[PDB]
Design a protein around this ligand. Structure first.
Ligand SMILES: [Ca+2]
Ligand SMILES: [Ca+2]
Ligand SMILES: [Mn+2]
Ligand SMILES: [Mn+2]
Ligand SMILES: [Mn+2]
Ligand SMILES: [Mn+2]
Lengths: 323, 319
């Protein structure tokens, strides 16, 4: 629909701007929201940042993290929606879409182009890369704090330069930002080395319960609610567990069953090279992306949800192995 | 002492053996192979060796079979990369009183055991020094050589997570990816290749994990019987101590490892300020400000652990 130049001109034409990110905010969301907000503020615009969700604790030390609001009181001329592929993903702020002109900036190919202006380019690994280019086009001078905030999303959305999307442009952007003072160590420490001690004792139980299925192609484990309690943990402590189980040699699908609170079992699935876990997840009542999906069961017994999910996963997997 | 001197020595010799440290890591493999392939571009006869089994995670890398264990060779020059002392190259230290030697390394504790020593602790990886040597030698990089040279920069920075991941690290990474370094291949092979048995071993490491200095220090240990119980080797525990440092508030993580039997290794990683190389040096080892280790021979793990902890705590309070 629109290109960066059109977005830059729209941003220049408006002064009271609300920058909105997607719910359940990750590094790229926080990075893209704050990097654009601060850039626009440096231009003298009246800007507020909003995400309809609690900002996770791992961001607590980041400069200007306080600028992201859950309940802003603001009368914007322009809504800028970043890193969100559809209106439901910005929560209660979608109710502004028919009241305020909107810009969309996103790297998700599934983006519905729900804005009055839409710059969507999936060749970027992170929306933060697109914000970096917008700020440059606007003449934003980066300091170390803004460089760190813009580096954040490029790091997290590439798995810290490990995913298949970490191409030359990603590494060029990272080099440029570190040269401007981005604190790569700070970012990694706060995002990746911020685990409660109790999470490690919980993870030990996960690993003791770990089992492989179907020629070591499927790995699964489970956390019952009483095991969370025993280690003084919640589902906040176990978020990164399923991705670790995917790193087993030969495993194509990792599955983790997580009962928290009691009776509520969330099932996370991650795949590696080819298996579309979103299809299995959707058929079980959930959904997601081809390599990362999930499904929630409410008011059920974990010992009954595990067979239910594994039986269907195994059927779909063998069907996929065949043709 | 400087790169230019090393380049001159390398140019003078046409039969060269390139050796790295035992218990090889990514920087060792990267530096050995990148320099070996670079020197071959000059028409030289070059062999690569490590006196140790090459870990499984490297087996799909291009030219990995060029690293030998028992080279059949009469070199004119020995080039030692990424090793801080003669003991760390195993049987090849026997060459040091016979063949002229070059040392290229980034450990602050290097004993300068070569005839020529280029030691620069400001580099995050020896592989950064090899990259510069190769370009000074005039070598042109194809994508396989770029991948091999990228490897060590990635692994010795914990894939751009350690405090040594500075602007020069990101410059080198960008330049190598621009020349075809497959960053994703490197990450998959090194980080997504864990044996199932490694996770069972790690579970015991986590069961034994303890905090000291009221949360600022974390440590665990693997006695030899526990490696055997889980059908594991030092290959399986390679990344463990870095994981222990990911505890919120921990400044230094320590892992004691007995492998093979009668070889007790201490691996230390620190986060923000504690100089673990000072501790390691005083115990007979060495390393970098944020990553260091020592190996003890003929000791009992039940005696090594409390004495090392005691010294670590002494140095921590002095820090
Ligand atoms: Ca103004
Ligand atoms: Ca908060
Ligand atoms: Mn995001
Ligand atoms: Mn994103
Ligand atoms: Mn090394
Ligand atoms: Mn090294």
């Amino acid at each position: 629909g629109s290109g960066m130049d059109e977005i830059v001109k729209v941003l220049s034409q408006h002064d009271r701007i609300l920058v909105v990110g997607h719910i359940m905010p990750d590094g790229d969301c926080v990075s893209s929201v704050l990097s654009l907000t601060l850039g626009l503020e440096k231009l003298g615009k009246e800007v507020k940042a909003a995400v309809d969700y609690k900002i996770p604790y791992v961001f607590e030390k980041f400069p200007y993290i306080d600028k992201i609001e859950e309940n802003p009181n603001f009368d914007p001329e322009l809504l800028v929606v970043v890193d969100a592929s559809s209106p439901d993903r910005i929560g209660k702020f979608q109710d502004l879409l028919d009241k305020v002109p909107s810009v969309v900036i996103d790297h998700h190919s599934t983006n519905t182009n729900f804005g009055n202006w839409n710059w969507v380019d999936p060749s970027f690994a992170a929306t933060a890369q697109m914000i970096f280019r917008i700020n440059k086009a606007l003449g934003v001078e980066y300091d170390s704090n803004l460089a760190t905030l813009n580096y954040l999303g490029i790091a997290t959305d590439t798995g810290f330069f490990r995913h298949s999307n970490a191409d030359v442009r990603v590494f060029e952007d990272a080099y440029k930002l570190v040269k401007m003072g981005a604190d790569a160590h700070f970012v990694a420490k706060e995002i990746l080395e911020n685990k409660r001690f109790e999470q490690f004792k919980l993870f030990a139980e996960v690993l003791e319960r770990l089992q492989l299925l179907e020629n070591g192609k499927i790995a699964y484990s489970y956390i019952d609610y009483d095991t969370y309690l025993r280690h003084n943990c919640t589902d906040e402590d176990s978020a990164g567990f399923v991705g670790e189980l995917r790193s087993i040699r030969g495993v194509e699908v990792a599955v983790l069953f997580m009962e928290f609170p009691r009776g509520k079992i969330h099932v996370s699935m991650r795949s590696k090279d080819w298996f579309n876990v979103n299809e299995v997840a959707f058929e079980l009542g959930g959904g997601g992306h081809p390599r990362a999906a999930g499904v929630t069961f409410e008011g059920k017994k974990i010992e009954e949800v595990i067979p239910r999910v594994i039986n269907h996963l195994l059927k779909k997997f063998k069907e996929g192995v065949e043709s």
